Amino acid sequence: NPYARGPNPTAASLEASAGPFTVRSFTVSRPSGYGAGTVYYPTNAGGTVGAIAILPGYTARQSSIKWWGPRLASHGFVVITIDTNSTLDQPSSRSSQQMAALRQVASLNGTSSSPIYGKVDTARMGVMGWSMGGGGSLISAANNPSLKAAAPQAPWDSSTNFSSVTVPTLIIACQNDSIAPVNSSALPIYDSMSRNAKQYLEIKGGSHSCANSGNSNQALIGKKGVAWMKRFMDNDTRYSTFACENPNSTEVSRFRTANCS
């Protein structure tokens, strides 16, 4: 497998705060088609790696989703955390900006002055995001089926019907979410998808921000997020168990998965 990177995973290696690779970051000097961006990248991944673009929620900024940057990049991904043109952007606009960020990561991969020069496999990209940014990620996957993976958290969109999505999608949900309640948002979105590998991971007792920076379940959520991205962005079957298993965690109130061996 030409995309396989890093050592064979264990629960401990996936639950740790950082993966095997050293991480550096830089601010995007002139963001093209979005508000602002921070790029996290591994210095020593051993090959080109996929790129992941992460959206914040309504009124929110990069701080809410920043922890994913070092966490994912330390396992061999280039990750751009996004500020949208307006904090009040709706999910459709949020999706366009997510793709613009992936577009600029690919452009920067071909820029000699950039720290990620030569570091990205621009054919392998994924999307993540919180709430409206989760709906934005789902729209990105629907419109761009070549995306290799999606992992929105506490998603919300004006529609819950994402039946066209063929991208492997992990729905991270928060049980006690009062902003985007699971019964009217995360669950129907999960249920709508009939054509893909998919998973529903509900954090017990979680408020709307249960997967944000500073959360108390970074070991569990970080493991699932990284494992899902490894399995599907890298086709890495060393991660099939971690990606598709019920994690048997006291912090999970609900678990569902389909087309996930």
Q: Which CATH number is 152's domain given?
A: 3.40.50.1820
DSSP state of 8: P
Please report whether residue 84 resides in a domain. yes
Burial class (CB in 10 A: 0-12, 13-18, 19+), 26: middle
Residue 1 covered by a domain: no
Closest CA to 76 of 253, 259, 229, 255: 229
Cα–Cα separations (whole angstroms), residue 190 to 25, 39, 100, 235, 255: 33, 29, 26, 22, 11
In a domain, 213, yes or no: yes
Binding positions are 58, 132, 156
Say how far apart CA 20 and CA 26 lie, in whole Å.
Answer: 20
229 falls within a domain = yes
131 is catalytic: yes
Catalytic residue among 83, 121, 177, 236: 177
Contact 114, 27 (CB under 8 A): no
4 falls within a domain: no
Given the residues 131, 140, 185, 209, the one annotated as active site: 131
32 classed as catalytic = no
Domain count, the chain: 1
Residue 3 lies in a domain: no
Is residue 99 in a domain? yes
Q: Specify the DSSP element, H or E, that contains 230.
A: helix 218-233
* Residue 190 within any structural domain of the chain: yes
Active site (annotated) includes residue 177: yes
Give me the domain span that covers residue 94.
11-258
Nearest to residue 212, comparing CAs of 164, 260, 179, 250? 179
